[PDB]
């Protein structure tokens, strides 16, 4: 087909679609993986590690990222405010322009972390 649509994104050829969408998504995924707050292990192990780290460091709120094995192309953001606070998981989508969290597009992982902290502060 002369016109290709991937959600709201519109492309004109297979190579254009590939380069503009898939390469950017892969780069953002690598940036998320290379980020200091990433863990590719299983969700239960991520929850256990977060619980242990929060119990050991109950003076701060800890957030980590992990793979969304059920929904490919997504990420689970698990954050625990304190040992007494329940672990809350948020959904992050790997988009070509960045990461979509709470209907907000963040160009980089550090920008995503700053936005998450600002959202937590505002909701608090």
């Amino acid at each position: 087909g002369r016109v290709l649509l991937v959600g709201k994104y519109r492309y004109h050829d297979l190579d254009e679609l590939l380069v503009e969408y898939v390469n950017n998504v892969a780069n953002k995924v690598e940036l998320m993986v290379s980020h200091d707050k990433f863990m590719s292990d299983s969700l239960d192990y991520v929850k256990e590690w977060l619980e242990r780290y929060s119990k050991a460091n109950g003076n701060r709120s800890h957030y980590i990222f992990t793979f969304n094995r059920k929904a490919p192309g997504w990420f689970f953001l698990l954050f625990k405010l304190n040992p007494t606070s329940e672990i809350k998981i948020w959904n992050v989508k790997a988009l070509p322009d960045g990461y979509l969290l709470a209907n907000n597009v963040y160009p980089d992982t550090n920008s995503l972390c700053n936005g998450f902290k600002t959202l937590m502060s505002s909701r608090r």
Binding site: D13, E16, L18, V19, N23
Partner: protein, 160 residues
Amino acid sequence: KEPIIVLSPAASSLVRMSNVKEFLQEGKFLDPSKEPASSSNLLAIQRKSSRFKTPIKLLVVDNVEKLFTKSEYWDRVVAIVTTGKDWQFKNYKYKDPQILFQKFNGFYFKYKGDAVPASVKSWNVKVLDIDRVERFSDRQVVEQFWDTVENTLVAKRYKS
């Protein structure tokens, strides 16, 4: 400051980052479809010429979005490789292909006997043919490409 050679990130390109080093430098052409994809978008090659006493070091860049933040980098561009696709030039210095191709050297690589795309014929770019079977002409084609590039380099009075 090393000059820059720009390649098309298109998958149909006959010259990609995976096989650019063996082609432009070593003179041997390999099919890029069979070669594994290269993770690095920056590469460095060495050119030996009779016009220059010493070999010239050049930088090969596939995507200019993350490497052309400054306008002064465009002064180092000595060759542009395109696949005849308009969408390559969305983020370029001259978003119109024509002006880019009068202000820069454009090269299009096609197999011998294949028909040239219409947009390529409407642009000011050189056409370089690579035979599908015989491999001795790869050095000749590379020599033509480097002849054009060296003419541009000498015209720019580059220091090496």
